Amino acid sequence: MVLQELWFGVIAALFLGFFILEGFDFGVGMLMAPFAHVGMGDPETHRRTALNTIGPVWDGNEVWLITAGAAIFAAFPGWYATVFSALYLPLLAILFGMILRAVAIEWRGKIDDPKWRTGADFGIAAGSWLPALLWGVAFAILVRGLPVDANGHVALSIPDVLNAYTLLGGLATAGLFSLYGAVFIALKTSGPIRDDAYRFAVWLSLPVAGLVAGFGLWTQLAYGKDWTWLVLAVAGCAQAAATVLVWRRVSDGWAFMCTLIVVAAVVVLLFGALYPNLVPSTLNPQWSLTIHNASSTPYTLKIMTWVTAFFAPLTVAYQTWTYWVFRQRISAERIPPPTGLARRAP
């Protein structure tokens, strides 16, 4: 019935918001190390300036993935069980990176020690490189499919995970977020840091376009639907505008917008190519998981719709307000001196 497709879309919407928001969270984490090595002046100030852009919003954004997983569990228990247990190894690294990032961001400035900050930098870097690469891989596997027998088991094999198509998914997602983060900083900051962020975007503009276009085109050709062509078309049109804007620095907001649509288009493209099934079966299409057989009972979906129908609008209602509050650009001259304590207690 309707509720099944409606909640499939809702789960797609949650991931669409996750990548739209966490997309630049990873990108900022990815770009912190390059900023230190390339930026002029002391490296530390640039790292703090870049980090503080996502300082007040990173915690709120990460909840989308948690809420996305909870929604998948509630609406499609079969989808939750089969996928996560099948992607145990890839998901373990993502969890490791997320664990490192969560503590590292808050604990980075708690102590004034070059070795301490170096350790925290690894936590943020390792907590952004891994989720960025693997989440692209993880969704590539779902679109490609997994070996699912009649009973419902998986019995995964290494070629089914590390395949040419999946690897392209990881690189495209990692590159796209890196570009997405670069433009985000160019919009949230000012001064030489903004110029460096623009410089990074220029280098990533063309290489990412090849990856995303190749990854998007491959998915559209192999597992895409009839209507997905428009999603790919707008992604190409959006990327073309995004690349022009960074090269010709005419507006920071529009450059962020065009890149945001590209991320949104990619997420819609994956789900659009994955509409009927939830875990396509390489062994046999009949055994593939479907929304019409792996979804919860009508009552559970009906109850969940009411809660989401009232909280999702509210969550977006004040989530945007949080960004509005901190809309003012930060710069190297507005960053306060470090407040950490010496490692050796006097």
């Binding site: 909870a70 569990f73 228990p77 088991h153 999702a312």
Partner: protein, 460 residues
């Protein structure tokens, strides 16, 4: 070691790590909100300094609290895929509601509180912490409600066609006896933990200032904090006893095996005696406790034995070993009950010393304060270990007065994973979480030994 045992160990370790920090957050957030609103109402600089001081400790604990909780979200599917299918239809709804109801609130509004000190108006900024204070409490209710379903599954029925439990009414699921009693008890435990933490940190600093780093300004700031923490701890203890008594009422009539596990009754007995030490030997027994914990009556109750329930369960369900790990549940219950002495004892002494405006200056008092901080955390961990390991054979305990087909053994809820694959995950989480916990403890020590920071001495 088979995959089932390794998966159980992984879940237990990854969750015990998570709940070393949860009690502090749930209890401390209301305390920080109270301190901030006191500052706003009375504009007293002393309360502002405390909010900034304990704010740093709260944020330090909050960060790792979120970090450890991420794994738990996915663990269900990763290791317990078979169990997820059985209860997913009814189990996911409490979890999904928590994500939308609590996580999005606390995570979003904690960021505003941290950075909105000089940006938002005082009134709005004050509401930010209060929203977080309510959000964490709500987060507990939905999560504890989800677990309460496993302890006492009600509001769901078994569908033979699909072979899984399906929901029948959310109102019944979220208002069952266990969820109410369990939530009102854990919240009391978190309040006790936060109050003890604040009192010990404050009292230690009171003694420090009195005997070293002499300064009237700092001691006059911490004394209110010490008194508030002690009063909160005493209030929480009174709540724990009442909620604890209620929990015993449900446990006896819901999971008789668990009740027979708290006191290892070999055979059914009338008016059983509560023994503190066992090696059974039954060293130093204590009557009138178990019957009261069962139905609040001094006498006139029969508690089924471990052995008596074993035959009944075997006949009702089938050949299997339904005996929990008697040793672990027994000693976890004893520790959880027995760890109330430290925080309660510390609170009474601390209040007495600070009576009539006095300031303690006894070195041993500082040692007592330091030795009391661990006790709430250990007590909270022990309680969860008991309630979970007290239902060891079952992952969804059968309901004596419900759908008998809504039941699942642990062995049938584990995913089909190779032993090697799970083993690496257990090592990865154990080492990483151990290192993070050590760093968290060291950071808390470093920030406590510094007390009020110079640049937080003026609200401006």
């Amino acid at each position: 070691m088979n995959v089932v045992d390794i998966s159980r160990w992984q879940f237990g370790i990854t969750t015990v790590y998570h709940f070393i920090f949860v009690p502090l957050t749930i209890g401390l957030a209301p305390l920080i909100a109270v301190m901030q609103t006191l500052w706003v109402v009375t504009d007293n600089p002393a309360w502002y300094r405390l909010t900034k001081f304990f704010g740093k400790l709260f944020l330090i604990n909050f960060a790792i609290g979120v970090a450890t909780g991420i794994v738990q979200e996915f663990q269900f599917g990763m290791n317990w895929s078979e169990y997820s299918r059985f209860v997913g239809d009814v189990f996911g709804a409490p979890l999904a509601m928590e994500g939308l109801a609590a996580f999005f609130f606390e995570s979003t509004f904690i960021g505003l509180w941290i950075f909105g000190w000089n940006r938002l108006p005082r009134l709005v900024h004050l509401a930010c912490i209060w929203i977080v204070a309510i959000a964490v409490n709500v987060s507990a209710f939905f999560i504890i409600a989800a677990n309460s379903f496993m302890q006492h599954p009600v509001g769901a029925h078994y569908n033979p066609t699909t072979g899984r439990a399906e929901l029948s009414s959310i109102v019944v699921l979220l208002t069952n006896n266990t969820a109410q009693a369990a939530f009102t008890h854990t919240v009391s435990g978190a309040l006790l933990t936060a109050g003890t933490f604040v009192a010990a940190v404050s009292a230690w600093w009171l003694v420090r200032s009195s005997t070293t780093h002499a300064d009237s300004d700092t001691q006059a700031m911490y004394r209110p904090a010490t008194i508030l923490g002690c009063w909160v701890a005493l209030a929480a203890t009174a709540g724990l006893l009442f909620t604890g008594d209620h929990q015993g009422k449900l446990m006896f009539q819901q999971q008789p095996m668990k009740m027979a596990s708290a006191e290892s009754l070999c055979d059914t007995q009338t008016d059983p005696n509560f023994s503190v030490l066992t090696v059974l030997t039954r060293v130093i027994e204590v009557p009138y406790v178990l019957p009261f914990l069962a139905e609040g009556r001094i006498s006139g109750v029969t508690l089924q034995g471990i052995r008596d329930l074993q035959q009944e369960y075997q006949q009702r369900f089938g050949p299997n070993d339904y005996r929990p790990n008697l040793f672990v549940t027994y000693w976890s219950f004893r520790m959880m009950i027995g760890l109330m002495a430290i925080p309660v004892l510390f609170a009474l002494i601390a209040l007495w010393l600070t009576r009539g405006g006095q300031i303690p200056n006894q070195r041993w008092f500082s040692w007592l304060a330091l030795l009391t901080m661990p006790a709430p955390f250990l007590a909270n961990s022990a309680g969860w270990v008991f309630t979970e390991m007290g239902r060891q054979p079952w992952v969804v305990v059968p309901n004596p007065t419900g759908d008998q087909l809504v039941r699942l053994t642990v062995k049938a809820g584990v995913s089909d994973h190779s032993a090697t694959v799970v083993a690496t995950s257990l090592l990865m989480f154990t080492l990483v979480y151990a290192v993070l916990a050590v760093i968290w403890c060291w950071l808390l020590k470093r920030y406590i030994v510094e007390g009020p920071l110079e640049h937080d001495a003026e609200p401006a």
